[PDB]
Design a protein around this ligand. Structure first.
Ligand SMILES: *[C@@H](C)[C@H]1/C(=C/c2[nH]c(/C=C3N=C(/C=C4\NC(=O)C(CC)=C4C)C(C)=C\3CCC(=O)O)c(CCC(=O)O)c2C)NC(=O)[C@@H]1C
Ligand SMILES: *[C@@H](C)[C@H]1/C(=C/c2[nH]c(/C=C3N=C(/C=C4\NC(=O)C(CC)=C4C)C(C)=C\3CCC(=O)O)c(CCC(=O)O)c2C)NC(=O)[C@@H]1C
Ligand SMILES: *[C@H](C)[C@H]1/C(=C/c2[nH]c(/C=C3N=C(/C=C4\NC(=O)C(CC)=C4C)C(C)=C\3CCC(=O)O)c(CCC(=O)O)c2C)NC(=O)[C@@H]1C
Ligand SMILES: *[C@H](C)[C@H]1/C(=C/c2[nH]c(/C=C3N=C(/C=C4\NC(=O)C(CC)=C4C)C(C)=C\3CCC(=O)O)c(CCC(=O)O)c2C)NC(=O)[C@@H]1C
Ligand SMILES: *[C@H](C)[C@H]1/C(=C/c2[nH]c(/C=C3N=C(/C=C4\NC(=O)C(CC)=C4C)C(C)=C\3CCC(=O)O)c(CCC(=O)O)c2C)NC(=O)[C@@H]1C
Ligand SMILES: *[C@H](C)[C@H]1/C(=C/c2[nH]c(/C=C3N=C(/C=C4\NC(=O)C(CC)=C4C)C(C)=C\3CCC(=O)O)c(CCC(=O)O)c2C)NC(=O)[C@@H]1C
Ligand SMILES: *[C@H](C)[C@H]1/C(=C/c2[nH]c(/C=C3N=C(/C=C4\NC(=O)C(CC)=C4C)C(C)=C\3CCC(=O)O)c(CCC(=O)O)c2C)NC(=O)[C@@H]1C
Ligand SMILES: *[C@H](C)[C@H]1/C(=C/c2[nH]c(/C=C3N=C(/C=C4\NC(=O)C(CC)=C4C)C(C)=C\3CCC(=O)O)c(CCC(=O)O)c2C)NC(=O)[C@@H]1C
Ligand SMILES: *[C@H](C)[C@H]1/C(=C/c2[nH]c(/C=C3N=C(/C=C4\NC(=O)C(CC)=C4C)C(C)=C\3CCC(=O)O)c(CCC(=O)O)c2C)NC(=O)[C@@H]1C
Ligand SMILES: *[C@H](C)[C@H]1/C(=C/c2[nH]c(/C=C3N=C(/C=C4\NC(=O)C(CC)=C4C)C(C)=C\3CCC(=O)O)c(CCC(=O)O)c2C)NC(=O)[C@@H]1C
Ligand SMILES: *[C@H](C)[C@H]1/C(=C/c2[nH]c(/C=C3N=C(/C=C4\NC(=O)C(CC)=C4C)C(C)=C\3CCC(=O)O)c(CCC(=O)O)c2C)NC(=O)[C@@H]1C
Ligand SMILES: *[C@H](C)[C@H]1/C(=C/c2[nH]c(/C=C3N=C(/C=C4\NC(=O)C(CC)=C4C)C(C)=C\3CCC(=O)O)c(CCC(=O)O)c2C)NC(=O)[C@@H]1C
Ligand SMILES: *[C@H](C)[C@H]1/C(=C/c2[nH]c(/C=C3N=C(/C=C4\NC(=O)C(CC)=C4C)C(C)=C\3CCC(=O)O)c(CCC(=O)O)c2C)NC(=O)[C@@H]1C
Lengths: 162, 172, 289, 194, 172, 162, 172, 162
């Protein structure tokens, strides 16, 4: 699970070496970031309901057929709408994990590995989620390092989907 | 492997929950200790050779059977392996201190180590004594008040002591 | 019975022994033989110092004031038994030992752990000890007058898993429950919880790979899921357990114990490679169908 | 028949390197570290990179992955599985002569370049005589493979860089694309453009 | 591999000289540029998919022979390999940008790549054309003034443009 | 050369991945450190002569037989004193490189790798150089982050020699 | 447990064969040596205490690390256990001598013994030395020509030597 | 294995005792017996084919239905006759082992323990083997201690079967 601290140790262990100033600087880099990430995670968490419901609507608006067409993969009934809001919630929650962990680890572990297989198997369009992730980017109201780190994880997922 | 942050994340994903307010504030408190944690890792690392060699010298002085002819630490190859092992264990303890989680130590170092030693005939109780001596030396170095910004490192010291305790228990 | 493999399994001496029975109107030599047998059985072949002997219980046994079973009960409840087997052990370890000492067999199932852990927790060690001794199984095998003994041979009421587990608890004749490689660790916690078994590794002296023990994590599973496909053209797969690997040295060698699944067509290469690793074959077991 | 004899040639891998871990030391991907799921991904990706240079979804071997993840097989077994895979046969065996196929195998499996044409020549006959699997097994069972990578480590190109130098020897996935002029002609490339 | 700092060290060691005051001051100026360098790497990375796909689209629109039957980017695998390669080159350019030195890009991507493509029959000139299109888009993304502390990134942008140019020259 | 920036890229490249928030944090840790490192490099360089001179004298005093015993490996003649001062100068200079690079890279590549062979082959005692390094440690008069990083490199060399 | 006679019988039964003439003759020759076997057993037995105690004294003189505080033979309990081990090995060697087959030694005395010593940390090479010291004393006792019908016992003495060697090898 | 030497040791071992004059007396008892045992084994071995063939015929004469009745358990065909001769040979061969061993050990270990299950499962009459054993008693031609020890084992087997 990629984070600065585990990557530092993973590299040193591969080399059979004690941690050196290089790894200590890695830790200092993490400490420089941690509070901004934690504050970003808090802000996303407290606004999570609004962001998720806003994102779902943004998808429905950009892709109207998803709420009009019948089929297990679409959100034309409350069942499909609940699935869609659930999924967007998953993306949001795991992004908050990345902010806490300081790395894409949680996204790699919990969401990204296998997402292609899911989307193909259940006939879900990656474009839908890309739209949802853009809305979250545009509406989380973060600033400074909180914004930059949050957007990088949101963009990481978008690039994984594209 | 887990670090202090991803350990908490793992337990949260298992329940499908955002980290709670108190959990986020706990991790902030961990961040506030970050410099102390780095210093402790740096002091142990800077003194690694002495920590190992002094501990080894004390071990063989207290347990001379190890180095008598026929003792497990007799012959250059066995003495070299023994000195290497103590350094390996100290190294992974610093890894665990650096990450703030025992997973690296438990997974990469202690897994199957008790079983390795019995299979080779290495006396694990004597390995554990060596770890103890390294622990004692390591904590004194970490607690050394000279040449460093003054503060309370009691919590980091306790954590480090815990990692040494795991190592000592695991080897036998 | 166990004939061909008896000696290498450490069973031959027990094949050669009869149950120690205290007959009515027993002689003093009879009483001494019972006392010796009970100390060896119930205390797991630990050396017993003269200061540790239960002289009063021995007197009462010699006098016929207590039967063999009541003498066993007294030994099992003594501070000597508890010091050896209770105060320093995980309770699952205690239950394993009680079964070996008092019933001469290994636990069959997780249900036995549930029963005895709750009984200990609710009523205390003495109550738990009584449950073994007052059990139907104890009554049927040993009754009032026979010292408990290892039940290696198949009996009515057995399960196969019992046979394999006895060699997790019994490690040879010149050995004690407190002088085994796993030391204080429960031998069967994982086997019982998962209802799994392990390849039998006989005692040292008669088995070069006697020290093979798996690690906490990163073990090779027993069966070859996927068959021969990953190996290419292969007729059948075997799981080989290997111990005492040293030759390449760290970091090329991390764990001295390893289990590998290899195809029939590579067994020659495997044995050659193992020898050059310095390792000793602990067990070979078919892994595919 | 015994393998045709050939002589070595001076190579970095043939001499002591006095190596100290740096950014140019190949990363050791081993299962002896009890790797988490995401970390196992990286090991699997490294193996695909080492053997295929790149595995499109079509190329990937999900069942071999599951078996490696579950401990059914070692890394060396996983590597054998990749070498026996449809992707490897189609990309590196069928599109090359036996001689170039041998070179690919030595580079990918042993992590070194071949000594000479004579080494390539000597091994080129093995597929025909011992079969495709016989070639792979010989290389994977060789003292050279086992001494360097053992059973639990993903192979890698060895001693490519020397300390203090700006560049090392060419990475094998650059030096040795899956096919060369022979198959290029059959495809009718290069394409005239402009 | 070298980075901006160790490039200077390598030259100094070859001369057996301490870094001069001006060399130290120059590296200090590099440090003062560090945030812009990080922002540029982050911006290219975050738009990598679009950079590659937009550049590839334009390339096949300008050189339709590549995707017509019998072309070098015709069939799904060849097209997939082409898209992959563009992403590889972009990835190594961000590495060079991150380190501030071209060595990683050359040692691990470009050195020998011309021969690679000649052996395969890949039109290296057309690869260079695609690299140029990624460069154009990438520099526009780096220079985007919206949503970032305003400042002058001309120096870093010129460096990035150079790495692209190095890549375009190397492939053909 | 092992540094935070080269290790970050090495990690990402070994995973076939673009740089992510984890590596960007590594670069921030480098930036937090770099100025102190450059100031330390400057301080050591300005004082190089007296540190090298003093360090050599510390060694001759601790080990008088080196200035009194004849033999190619000792410093009983001017030839040997020059070699010794040269060697100590190498250590000091390369340590300044590590401060500039922010890692043990320069020490590893220019000095440590193979140092055992040299010391065995030419019958040089590692303890001589340890004493010199202790002298430089006790006489460079750095403070704060410059001290801590500089000392990490001196201790790294001392550890390699023992 | 086999004795000399049933060792041959077990081998024959596994083959489904009658014992051959030579095998019966070999047993006849074994019977003719019976009195010397009995004497040898009686002599080792009659001196058992002195053999054990003298070997133990010599071992601890040569290996004082064993009995100093922290040593494996330090404290009355461990020392008593050590002396029991010596007596037991000697007892089983007399069993082997009496039966004319090593099986009693293998099946009981040496079955699991190495595991015991490794588990406990008993220095097995030290036990081997003790066993070697008992062997020397025991062989001298068997060989003593005073007070016995004179004859050649070299064959029984060689057999007894083997049993001691087996025991020593099992722990070393 | 019940033999004098092994049981002497087994009993002594269960008592944790060195061998004493009691066990030595057992050894002398074995030595007094062994030569006659070995001679009895030789005579039975040399005569084995006559004894076995003679014993089988004695069985067939005494129980003529066994050579006339069809069935897997009878000797009405060469298959059954071969099984019968084999079986008698086992008895004879294992009896020679008892003479070599000086005890019923070989008969207990190899033949007697479990014989009742075998004869029940395969519907073989113990009376058949009693008659074979009686023939062997009448026709082995031994005298003195060889006869007495040999007859004790033949009678041991007969008693086991009845
Ligand atoms: C217990 C561990 C001891 C202790 C530690 C302690 N350290 C600090 C503060 C700092 N320590 C560092 C460390 C480094 N700076 C570098 O450049 C490097 C080399 C790569 C290292 C290892 C830093 C950066 C700081 C912060 C700034 C400062 O110098 O103060 C503190 C203060 C608390 C804090 O930082 O939060 C403490 C307490 N102090 C003791 O008394 C123990 C013996
Ligand atoms: C090597 C072992 C030494 C040796 C032995 C030896 N002994 C004999 C003969 C006899 N020894 C005995 C022994 C005993 N008689 C008893 O009543 C008991 C007590 C229970 C014992 C132990 C006996 C019975 C004999 C036979 C009669 C006799 O007195 O000789 C011999 C002679 C050859 C033979 O095997 O009979 C020998 C060689 N002799 C030595 O010189 C060795 C030091
Ligand atoms: C250059 C092409 C463009 C540009 C860049 C620019 N950035 C800064 C300053 C900062 N940028 C960052 C970046 C991050 N903070 C984080 O936490 C992360 C996520 C891991 C990133 C990527 C930071 C930390 C700073 C410093 C503080 C600040 O918020 O300003 C500047 C200002 C100068 C400086 O060096 O700080 C500039 C110029 N600005 C442009 O206009 C270009 C389009
Ligand atoms: C004598 C020439 C000089 C000297 C010796 C000295 N040696 C040690 C310590 C050790 N010596 C060894 C050597 C070996 N151990 C082996 O097993 C073998 C191979 C069979 C050898 C050659 C070892 C391993 C040690 C360290 C462990 C131990 O104490 O046994 C010391 C003490 C070092 C210390 O710090 O305790 C000394 C003094 N010293 C001189 O000054 C002599 C000129
Ligand atoms: C007969 C077709 C084959 C055969 C069998 C054979 N088995 C043994 C010994 C044992 N069999 C078992 C089996 C079980 N014990 C159980 O508890 C269960 C279920 C309740 C089973 C199935 C056991 C445990 C033993 C050993 C213990 C004992 O027998 O009491 C033997 C004898 C082994 C020996 O003598 O050493 C044999 C012969 N053998 C063949 O060749 C047939 C193919
Ligand atoms: C409660 C907070 C959590 C929980 C507990 C749980 N435990 C078990 C089962 C067992 N617990 C033990 C524990 C011990 N054995 C000992 O010897 C000691 C020390 C003296 C301890 C603490 C054991 C051995 C078992 C197995 C036997 C048994 O089942 O009692 C269970 C049952 C598991 C099952 O599958 O039956 C449970 C539920 N479970 C949770 O979810 C809580 C977080
Ligand atoms: C020193 C205090 C004690 C001691 C040590 C000793 N160890 C060995 C051999 C090995 N030790 C290991 C250890 C590890 N492998 C791992 O992967 C890790 C965790 C990352 C560790 C710690 C291994 C694998 C071996 C075997 C391979 C090798 O020898 O390098 C020996 C030599 C054994 C031999 O029989 O030659 C020794 C001597 N011995 C003592 O007596 C001290 C108490
Ligand atoms: C010493 C008198 C001169 C000298 C030597 C020098 N050589 C190298 C590097 C290498 N030398 C070899 C040699 C061999 N490879 C083989 O297989 C064989 C036969 C077994 C030989 C002799 C190799 C392959 C290398 C490169 C790999 C490595 O160095 O580990 C160097 C290092 C070059 C560098 O840039 O590091 C040097 C210094 N140099 C002189 O100045 C002397 C004249
Ligand atoms: C789906 C209906 C259910 C489900 C499945 C599930 N399985 C695993 C993990 C594994 N599955 C296998 C199975 C195979 N591997 C093979 O090679 C073959 C034979 C050709 C089979 C059948 C294996 C070996 C594993 C473990 C290794 C791996 O991860 O691939 C998981 C993952 C569990 C984990 O992450 O540890 C899951 C989820 N799970 C359900 O809940 C469904 C009922
Ligand atoms: C039609 C069902 C829908 C649709 C099609 C559409 N496709 C593209 C672009 C491409 N199509 C392919 C497909 C192939 N190329 C091959 O070589 C082969 C194998 C022989 C296949 C199947 C590819 C590779 C591309 C991209 C490169 C190219 O342009 O040729 C587009 C344009 C996409 C763009 O961004 O330019 C479109 C429109 N679109 C619909 O809406 C239809 C329902
Ligand atoms: C796209 C703009 C153009 C194009 C590309 C193209 N490339 C290939 C095949 C390969 N490219 C490489 C490249 C590399 N290997 C390395 O190690 C590195 C550095 C990490 C690089 C950049 C390789 C090795 C191959 C062959 C192996 C493979 O494809 O997996 C192809 C396909 C050729 C084939 O069939 O192998 C294509 C199409 N083609 C165009 O027409 C565009 C101009
Ligand atoms: C002193 C009052 C008289 C005396 C003493 C004496 N003792 C020995 C030998 C041993 N003494 C012990 C005792 C202990 N070992 C322990 O570990 C402990 C518990 C902590 C005790 C009490 C032992 C075990 C021995 C034998 C082994 C050894 O030598 O260490 C001797 C020598 C005996 C011999 O045969 O070598 C002596 C002389 N003797 C007197 O006459 C004093 C009046
Ligand atoms: C004395 C020369 C060395 C020594 C011995 C020592 N042994 C033990 C403990 C045990 N010894 C045995 C051996 C046997 N038990 C048997 O029943 C048999 C015959 C079949 C044998 C050979 C056993 C089983 C044990 C463990 C049981 C127990 O009660 O200890 C110890 C005790 C260790 C301890 O108490 O921790 C000792 C000291 N130790 C040395 O240092 C000498 C080299």
């Amino acid at each position: 699970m990629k984070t600065p601290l585990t990557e530092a140790v993973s590299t040193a262990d591969s080399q059979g070496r004690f941690l050196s100033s290089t790894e200590l600087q890695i830790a200092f880099g993490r400490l420089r970031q941690a509070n901004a990430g934690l504050q970003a995670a808090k802000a996303l968490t407290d606004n999570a309901q609004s962001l998720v419901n806003g994102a779902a609507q943004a998808v429905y608006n950009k892709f109207p057929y998803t709420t009009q067409t019948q089929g297990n993969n679409f959100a034309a009934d409350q069942r499909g709408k609940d699935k869609c809001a659930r999924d967007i919630g998953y993306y949001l929650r795991i992004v908050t994990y990345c902010l806490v962990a300081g790395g894409t680890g949680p996204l790699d572990e919990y969401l990204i590995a296998g997402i292609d297989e899911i989307n193909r198997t259940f006939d879900l369009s990656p474009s839908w989620y890309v739209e949802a992730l853009k809305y979250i980017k545009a509406n989380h109201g973060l600033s400074g390092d909180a914004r930059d780190e949050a957007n990088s994880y949101l963009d990481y997922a978008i690039n994984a989907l594209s | 492997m887990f670090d202090v942050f991803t350990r908490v994340v793992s337990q949260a994903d298992a329940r499908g929950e955002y980290l709670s307010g108190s959990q986020l504030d706990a991790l902030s408190a961990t961040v506030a200790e970050g410099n102390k944690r780095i210093d402790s890792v740096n002091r142990i690392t800077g003194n690694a050779s002495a920590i190992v060699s002094n501990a080894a010298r004390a071990l063989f002085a207290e347990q001379p059977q190890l180095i008598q002819p026929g003792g497990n630490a007799y012959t250059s190859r066995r003495m070299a392996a023994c000195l290497r092992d103590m350094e390996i264990i100290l190294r992974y303890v610093t890894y665990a201190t650096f990450t703030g989680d025992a997973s690296v130590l438990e997974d990469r170092c202690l897994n199957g180590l008790r079983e390795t030693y019995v299979a080779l005939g290495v006396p694990g109780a004597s390995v554990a004594a060596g770890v103890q001596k390294m622990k004692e030396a390591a904590l004194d170095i970490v607690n050394d008040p000279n040449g460093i910004t003054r503060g309370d490192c009691s919590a980091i010291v306790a954590e480090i002591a815990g990692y040494f305790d795991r190592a000592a228990a695991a080897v036998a | 019975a166990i004939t061909t493999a008896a000696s290498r399994l450490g069973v031959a001496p027990y094949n050669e022994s009869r149950p120690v029975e205290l007959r009515p109107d027993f002689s003093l030599d009879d009483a001494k033989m019972v006392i010796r047998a009970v100390y060896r059985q119930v205390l797991g072949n630990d050396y017993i110092m003269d200061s540790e002997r239960l002289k009063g219980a021995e007197s009462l046994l010699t006098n016929g004031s207590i039967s063999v079973r009541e003498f066993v009960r007294t030994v099992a409840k003594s501070e000597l038994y508890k010091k050896k087997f209770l105060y320093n052990n995980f309770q699952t370890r205690v239950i394993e030992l009680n079964y070996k000492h008092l019933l001469g067999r290994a636990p069959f199932s997780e249900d036995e752990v549930i029963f005895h852990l709750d009984l200990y927790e609710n009523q205390g060690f003495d109550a738990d000890i009584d449950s073994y001794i007052d059990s139907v199984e104890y009554q049927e095998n040993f009754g009032e007058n026979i010292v408990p003994y290892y039940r290696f041979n198949n009996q009515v009421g057995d399960r196969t898993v019992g046979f394999t587990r006895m060699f997790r608890l019994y490690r040879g004749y010149a050995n004690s429950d407190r002088s085994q490689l796993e030391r204080s660790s429960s031998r069967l916690a994982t086997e019982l919880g998962q209802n799994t078994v392990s390849a039998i590794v006989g005692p040292s002296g008669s088995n070069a790979g006697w020290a093979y023990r798996p690690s906490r994590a990163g073990n090779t599973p027993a069966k070859a899921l996927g068959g021969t496909v990953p190996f290419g053209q292969a007729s059948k797969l075997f799981r080989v357990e290997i111990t005492a690997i040293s030759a390449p040295g760290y970091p090329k060698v991390r764990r001295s114990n390893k289990a590998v699944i290899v195809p029939f067509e590579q067994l020659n290469q495997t044995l050659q490679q193992i020898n050059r690793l310095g390792g000793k074959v602990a067990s070979i077991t078919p892994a595919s169908l | 028949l015994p393998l045709l004899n050939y002589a070595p040639k001076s190579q970095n891998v043939r001499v002591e390197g006095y190596e100290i871990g740096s950014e140019e030391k190949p990363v050791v991907f081993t299962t002896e570290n009890i790797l988490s799921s995401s970390d196992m991904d990286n090991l699997i990706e490294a193996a695909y990179r080492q053997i295929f240079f790149h595995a499109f979804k079509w190329d990937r071997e999900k069942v071999l992955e599951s078996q490696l993840r579950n401990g059914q097989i070692t890394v060396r077994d996983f590597v054998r599985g990749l070498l026996l895979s449809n992707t490897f046969r189609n990309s590196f065996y069928e599109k090359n002569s036996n001689y170039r196929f041998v070179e690919h195998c030595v580079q990918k499996i042993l992590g070194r370049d071949v000594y000479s044409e004579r080494e390539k020549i000597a091994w080129s006959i093995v597929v025909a005589t011992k079969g495709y699997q016989g070639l792979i097994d010989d290389l994977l069972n060789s003292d050279e493979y086992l001494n360097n990578f053992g059973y639990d480590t993903v192979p890698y190109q060895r001693r490519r860089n020397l300390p203090g130098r700006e560049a090392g020897e060419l990475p094998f996935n650059i030096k040795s694309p899956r096919y060369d002029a022979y198959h290029r002609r059959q495809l009718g490339f290069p394409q005239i453009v402009w």
